[PDB]
């Protein structure tokens, strides 16, 4: 039985999603790459460069027409005639549209591909545009976060490969199995929130007791992700456990919702 080809494209990005992917403990990225998918194109890891790299896309798209996964990290810019992101001397958007046309499914990795992330923050000099605003005729699963949790990324792959199906999505196209809960729902500091027990200044007595970070700007109450329960790096910690409020990094437009340190209104 063939392993499903994955063509992993990179637009404008910081490569945090590729890095998060290889942090996965369950499953190991090694086991995903050797035993689950065929990772046939990926600028980060692939042996081939230049003409030899670009030749892979046509080969896979022909042999596995309508039976490969397009994974997108980053996004296309619409300013500078698209040449603020150049691949093979051409705008990235041309590569994205080409590979998208015969994909069985499209994964938008991270906030860049999902929504725009930091390059799309005001005033968006490159007109960086999320994948679903460019590719409008293909099924897209959004996996937002800057980056998403490693096990959320490999969990999406594992589901799609086991079932040959996209998992159930919410209205924003995020998998319900990972994005159904707000951080604030199961945040271990919630009993402090409920008792009005808050940090007011960094390293105050309240901070040393792990009091709620709401008044330090925590956006956990408006942010959907698995960070409070699944946590990060094989369940070692998350932003709040290590003492910083959630900055809302899985939510659309989180860079332009005011200072990270300004509290939410109407507690």
């Amino acid at each position: 039985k063939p392993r499903t080809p994955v063509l992993w494209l990179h637009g404008l990005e910081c490569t945090c999603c590729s890095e998060s992917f290889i942090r996965s403990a369950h499953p190991l990225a090694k086991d995903v790459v050797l035993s689950m998918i065929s990772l046939d194109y990926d600028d980060t890891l692939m042996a081939a460069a230049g003409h030899q790299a670009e030749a892979i896309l046509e080969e896979i798209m022909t042999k596995y027409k309508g039976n490969y996964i397009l994974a997108v990290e980053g996004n296309p810019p619409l300013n500078q005639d698209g040449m603020s992101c150049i691949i093979g001397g051409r705008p990235f958007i041309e590569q994205l549209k080409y590979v998208a046309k015969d994909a069985k499914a499209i994964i938008s990795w991270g906030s860049c591909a999902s929504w725009g992330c930091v390059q799309a923050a005001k005033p968006n000099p490159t007109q960086a545009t999320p994948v679903h605003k460019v590719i409008t005729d293909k099924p897209i699963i959004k996996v937002p976060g800057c980056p998403p949790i490693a096990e959320v990324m490999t969990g999406v792959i594992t589901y799609m490969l086991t079932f040959d199906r996209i998992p159930e999505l919410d209205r924003q196209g995020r998998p319900k199995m990972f994005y159904s809960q707000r951080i604030h729902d199961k945040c271990y500091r919630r009993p402090h929130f409920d008792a009005g027990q808050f940090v007011e200044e960094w390293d105050d007595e309240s901070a040393r007791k792990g009091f709620c970070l709401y008044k330090m700007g925590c956006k956990g109450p408006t942010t959907y992700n698995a960070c409070s329960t699944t946590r990060w790096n094989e369940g070692t910690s998350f932003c709040i456990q290590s003492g910083h409020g959630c900055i809302g990094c899985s939510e659309d437009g989180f860079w332009d919702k005011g200072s990270f340190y300004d509290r939410l209104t109407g507690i």
Binding site: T15, C16, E19, Q52, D81, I86, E234, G243, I247
Partner: protein, 598 residues
């Protein structure tokens, strides 16, 4: 043709295009010209992305900046956050407490190890290692090689190497080669015997499983990796021993120490020995190409003071070397308008006057995507870029007008130069270099039955091999240093100092109504600086000059070439249509193109 920096550039030969350059971070195009004997006589570095973080920061709160600029790069994750909080602290005259200093140093040294080891195995190794040759290896002779290369590494049995080889065989025999598809396997540019290839592929897989453990140090102190959290004035990870309710308690510190001890074993037993062995065998093949600017001009800001805010105690002492004179280290001042400057003469940006370089406090980022008259192709379909005009999204940083190489090799040449002038803080890197030269010249040749050589460090270091070596040694040194930092952190906490943040100037009501600051970091790829101007509580200007900006830079107003272009010069290619040598040398700089362009 023109001469610059002792290089005779000639574009009359056969033009070769590599787009995309793979096994880097982000987007790069490389073009070369080769002569009648396939020798590179011209090289062109094109950064093929831009996001405009410097523009996006305008008008925002300086306290938020670290989180925006951290997203310049997820590979060198956190080094921009560190530069940012340092720049804001410098602008506002904030001194962080000792525990915050030590935790930031441990996070920085964790990034160095993770970034360096993943670079070498997962991005660089396939330029030296033929995975298809690994299939031909004898497991017993692979076991024997492993015991010679690193006697202390416990994973050495013939059975172990046989099991790894069998998994690679099954993978290749499937006909779905994945990351190995359309590779340059069997090129005469590859010189390792099968056994060395199988050992290296085995360590590729070992490193892929282990690298996720190392970053749990970031997760403890910074909540997550990639993109751990930072804080203007200290660290958010408050300390309470008596206590599970605090971000940092003794159990969490014990966990960090366990991860540091694993790092020290990996660097000593796997990474440094592999680079010494592979370096020895490519040295024996005569492959000493790729020195570029490392033979003349190197720069680093200097880093890791063993006394906080005391630069004389930098454990990687910095400065600038010119003209290959290692007897004279010039001091580098990031505040001096006549030292660090960026040109855009050959970049897709515009200045009022592009005959001048701007110091980053006066920096300007206005995009100007325009192609030269000698372009082959169109604005949206480039066949051959015109390097006589604007050819990159990377600006051209220079130091007092000089083109410099930055990175671990630059830091190790500077450490060596400092140690020879009597700097005791540089003793460990000097020891590593002398040990490495003896292993590469004598010990490893003797063990493998090869001739002993007499290369000096002056000869060995300015090369693609030397650049690869310096990165591995720096990984080892950073692991050793963070081990000491951990002891100092625990001792300070046990002595009764639990402070992690200075909040005296957290509120912008306390700030001067205008200020400027600079933050520098010895980032994994070289010299990083962030330059900020603050006005009425907001970011007025924010300019980043990033290590790959230095190394990957296009030509300046005077036509001087940067480190990437210089490094490719005068390198023979086995096959001009297979970029094996181009990738090996470019990859030795560990290019981060999102960093370079931001």
């Amino acid at each position: 043709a023109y001469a610059t920096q002792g290089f005779n550039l000639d574009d009359r030969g056969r033009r070769i295009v590599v787009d995309p350059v793979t096994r880097i971070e982000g987007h790069m195009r490389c073009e070369v010209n080769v002569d009648a004997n396939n020798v590179i006589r011209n090289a062109v570095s094109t950064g093929t992305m831009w996001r405009g973080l410097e523009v996006i920061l305008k008008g925002r709160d300086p306290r938020d900046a670290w989180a925006f600029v951290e997203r310049i790069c997820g590979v060198c994750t956190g080094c921009h956050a560190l530069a940012s909080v340092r720049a804001v602290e410098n602008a506002l005259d904030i001194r962080i407490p000792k525990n915050a200093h030590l935790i930031r140093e441990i996070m920085a040294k964790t990034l160095q190890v993770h970034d360096h080891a993943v670079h070498f195995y997962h991005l660089h190794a396939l330029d030296w290692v033929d995975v298809m040759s690994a299939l031909k290896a004898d497991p017993k002779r692979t076991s024997e090689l492993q015991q010679l290369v690193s006697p202390a590494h416990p994973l050495s049995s013939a059975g172990y190497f046989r099991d790894i080889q069998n998994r690679l065989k099954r993978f290749v025999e499937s006909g779905q080669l994945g990351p190995f598809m359309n590779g340059y396997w069997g090129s005469k540019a590859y010189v390792l015997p099968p056994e060395a290839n199988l050992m290296a592929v085995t360590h590729y897989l070992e490193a892929l499983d282990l690298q996720k453990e190392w970053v749990k140090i970031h997760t403890i102190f910074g909540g997550k990796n990639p993109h751990p959290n930072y804080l203007v004035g200290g660290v958010p990870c408050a300390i309470n021993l008596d206590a599970a309710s605090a971000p940092v308690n003794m159990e969490r510190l014990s966990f960090v120490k366990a991860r540091i001890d694993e790092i020290i074993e990996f660097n000593k037993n796997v990474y440094v020995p592999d680079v010494l062995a592979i370096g020895t065998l490519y040295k024996q093949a005569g492959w000493l190409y790729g020195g570029g600017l490392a033979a003349t001009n190197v720069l680093d800001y200097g880093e890791y003071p063993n006394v906080a805010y005391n630069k004389s105690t930098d454990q990687l002492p910095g400065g600038a070397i010119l003209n290959g004179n290692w007897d004279e280290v010039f001091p580098v001042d990031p505040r001096d308008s006549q030292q660090v400057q960026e040109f855009v003469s050959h970049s897709w940006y515009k200045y009022a006057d592009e005959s001048v370089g701007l110091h980053p406090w006066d920096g300007v980022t206005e995009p100007n995507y325009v192609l030269g008259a000698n372009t082959k192709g169109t604005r949206t379909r480039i066949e051959q870029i015109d390097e006589s005009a604007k050819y990159s999204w990377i600006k051209s940083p220079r130091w007092r007008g000089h083109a410099m190489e930055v990175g671990p090799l630059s830091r190790y040449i500077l450490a060596y130069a400092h140690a020879r002038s009597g700097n005791k803080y540089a003793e460990r890197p000097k020891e590593q270099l002398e040990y490495s030269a003896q292993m590469i010249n004598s010990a490893i040749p003797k063990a493998l039955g090869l001739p002993e050589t007499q290369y000096t460090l002056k000869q060995l270091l300015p090369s693609t091999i030397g650049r690869t070596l310096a990165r591995a040694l720096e990984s080892q040194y950073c692991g050793e240093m963070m081990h000491s930092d951990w002891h100092d952190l625990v001792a300070n906490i046990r002595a009764g100092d639990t402070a992690t943040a200075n909040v005296d100037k957290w509120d912008p009501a306390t700030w001067p109504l205008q200020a400027k600051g600079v933050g520098t970091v010895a980032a994994p790829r070289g010299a990083l600086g962030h330059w900020i101007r603050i006005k009425d509580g907001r970011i007025e200007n924010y300019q980043c000059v990033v290590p790959t900006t230095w190394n990957g830079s296009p030509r300046d107003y005077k036509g001087q070439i940067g480190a990437f272009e210089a490094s490719l010069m005068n390198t023979p290619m086995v096959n001009p249509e297979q970029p094996v040598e181009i990738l090996r040398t470019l990859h030795s700089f560990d290019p981060c193109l999102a960093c370079s362009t931001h």
